[PDB]
Symmetry: D2
Subunit: 285 residues, 4 copies
């Protein structure tokens, strides 16, 4: 029962027809906030992990250690909480590293992850090179007897086109991927078509706030037939805007000016104070 996110996510995917909405989180505060609000699944972003943990742009700076550490932290805030889908980029190396990444994610209670066809160093590797990554990942999840949900992501739309994306996804499905992710749709028509081309194999829609793809609402994605929808930049973007506006006020007016109900104790409560108090009180000292 505890640390069973993979099993939980797989249940949502196989035993329900609901659109699994996963807000993009990147640290403990953002994750705890999504938990407070009752989201049924969370998504740990690579760009957010990089920006927050390393203060760097999303240019393959975060490696396995950074990603696993952030995912291990987020997925286990509540041992009985919502499953976590995490970006696994290209696996951080050759097949040995892809396998290591999947094993570490599995061990860390991560529910699933997306693995792409980009070069590790928008360019994609050959179809065969991509399948080497998928194969390594699937073999690992099978060897570990895990319900881990492997999402096959293809970034080939821009450079190779729609047909190539569909063929790559079909090939990934044959290799054992559980869900497909065609990144960067140019239109809503194209998004609905990818779903129909791969049906009944489930697809995941990646919504990038203020990105280059069209706006698709949760209701629209559900009607299109997607099974999972992740929200990249959903928390990093508003956090930045708020931090910036507040700091400008401090710089120019000499006061922080945050609404008074956002107290240190409220933040501690969002971050697990009650669980800590129960441990402390239960211990009798």
């Amino acid at each position: 029962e505890p640390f069973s996110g993979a099993k939980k996510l797989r249940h949502l995917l196989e035993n329900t027809d609901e659109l699994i909405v996963c807000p993009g989180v990147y640290d403990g505060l953002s994750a705890r906030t999504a938990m407070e609000l009752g989201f049924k699944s969370l998504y740990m972003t690579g760009a957010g992990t990089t920006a927050s943990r390393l203060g760097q742009p999303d240019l393959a700076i975060a490696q396995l250690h950074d990603m696993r550490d952030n995912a291990d932290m987020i997925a286990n805030l509540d041992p009985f909480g919502p499953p976590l889908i995490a970006d696994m980029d290209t696996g951080y190396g050759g097949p040995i590293m892809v396998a290591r990444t999947v094993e570490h994610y599995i061990r860390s209670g991560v529910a699933g992850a997306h693995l792409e066809d980009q070069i590790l160093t928008k360019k994609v590797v050959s179809r065969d090179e991509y399948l080497v990554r998928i194969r390594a990942a699937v073999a690992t999840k099978r060897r570990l007897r895990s319900d881990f949900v492997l999402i096959a992501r293809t970034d080939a739309l821009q450079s190779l086109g729609y047909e190539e994306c569909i063929e790559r996804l079909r090939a990934a499905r044959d290799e054992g991927a559980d869900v497909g992710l065609l990144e960067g749709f140019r239109s809503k028509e194209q998004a609905a078509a990818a779903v129909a081309a791969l049906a009944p194999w489930p697809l995941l829609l990646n919504s990038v706030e203020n990105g280059h793809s069209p706006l698709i609402t949760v209701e629209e994605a559900k009607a299109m037939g997607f099974r999972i929808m992740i929200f990249s930049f959903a928390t990093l973007a508003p956090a930045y805007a708020a931090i910036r506006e507040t700091l400008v006020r401090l710089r120019d007016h000499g006061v922080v000016g945050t609404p008074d109900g956002i107290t240190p104790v409220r933040l501690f409560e969002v971050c697990g104070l009650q669980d800590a108090m129960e441990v402390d009180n239960g211990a009798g000292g």
Copy 2:
């Protein structure tokens, strides 16, 4: 010149009479935002580090590794950037650990840190036990020939009173602390009096947004005579409020709805994209 934050902070303290304003930062995004806005010094919070890196409340959960890792990351985002003052709590153990903490902070380019009299396990240790911590810290900075600014913090006001705080600060000053921090003033009158009681030794004012102490503006603190003013919760609080409001919108309306100018590229730029592009372009491949 690079990694010289301690020297820079010491210059501001000794060669100027300005009030050094340090917004409380807790991750790469918050730190990069403060940098973008031109703050002359930053403050890394313990509560924020704990909430963001660990998703936990501020109950002595973050230890040396967590604190040093976050401080090392923040202080070095720009090798030629603003100095970083970091919370060092009680030093994470006995004198061996206090010394290790100071050494690690120094090695990591941290400019200064505050060390308190709280129990490690509001209660404070004896005056002598506190001085053991200060002594260990000062000896370390001296052995390493560093300009590190050691701030002696006392949390004794609530349980022991004002006089005790003043005597503890005077004792810490004699042991080699560079700045004093009387935590949790109950009034503005009391804040101005502490400054006068320790003059000309410099004091630091810790402003806790939405906390239990009275509101003191930057102009007021400057007139009171404080030399440094740190802003606890200045970025963690508004980040939470914004993340929460956005996620409620996603949950109930199906859209994130973040102002359109907060794009992934703008976030990357705030997080060092230009520096990365210069490295990439300069390398010729």
Copy 3:
């Protein structure tokens, strides 16, 4: 089946009468060597972790992060391998930290750990203060529905005597500890008596190579009735002697001089080369 060390160790303890021999390991090489030789359980030492990962003496320098990272690494080298018992010292703080430590160890596949009565800063805490630690640990293992084996260690012999040790162990057993560890026996007679005083509750014997306690062989400990025997310094000590002798030869003779069969490939094989080759080959690229 994978990551089931706790269940495996508990099976050995409850379903067999064998003396579980656990060599003290401290890094990947020492652990892989014990695995190569077929040991049924391993013991991760605190002194060894500190010396190897931090290059420091055993003076409460390693904290939770260091210990969990080394244990997570060792326990999972083989997902289907031998259980790992790890030192957990005093839990690295108050009950909140004791609980965090147990939870992290459990999550990391650690099979069991020893928790002591020493001060965290040979002195021991009060009986009640020690029971607060045991209580926190037991409650955590129960909340997580884990088979984790909690070993209650008492370091009270020197300062308080034998009777006090026995009463502390009995109290720990009542609080839920699974095994007792009376550290530092002064004689073999005393060791056999502790076993008889706590029978049928199982005891663990800690053999410290070149330490201050008398030499007890595996056969002797088994006859005395101990159920687990750990070997502190079993690998760190000979590694040091060998490294020293080799480096003296390099310094004075200009050659390393290591027996020729200890090749880089043999070391890689000990360290999992075959598993890596199977992943690489299976991936098809």
Copy 4:
């Protein structure tokens, strides 16, 4: 003066004609032992770091985090100690990562490092691709105003031949590398010739204990004209042999049997006990 390893190594290289002997170390114990014996420079191995910290073979499993953490630990055991040369492999990614690696190594007090032409995923990249790595590294050391010693390593001998190695080294020298390393000489004649072909630019000889290259003594390497000689596997190999023999004795005879003078206190002394005692005693509590 403290944390000045780069300056110290550069002094040995530029102001002396001595052969700088660097034993390969991989953890705190091995490094502390080399320090105890008075070695003037140390070499942190990649294979050893991987085996010890990760328990894995040398197959690009250790990434920047692992390498920097081990190097940061080793180089700073004594702030006034011997310089550390560390393996930096291929820089762990494209130029952005090469630069990040050099910056992190510099910040961590590392004195120098070797950067190679191998593929990151014996094969080498094109000459131009290799120079991109060297360029990124050199630009970083210059931007940081560091004395860091960059060693250009070429693994091209096997697949491309001697001439190609010499041309790659000459090109690397023009880009700013400080020392060259032609890896894997097939004979002593070839080693002396490489030195003469690049004279007066200094070369480093990598001695791999029980490897595939011929045995060259320190006296011989000095006469050949090499300026630095590193000893890969010098400590990992004998540690393994000793750990194995000891564990076989424990398994088959029930006793560890380590010479009695290798006591826990002696190991603590090798690992910095005296420094810790001075901190503890000096603090007055």
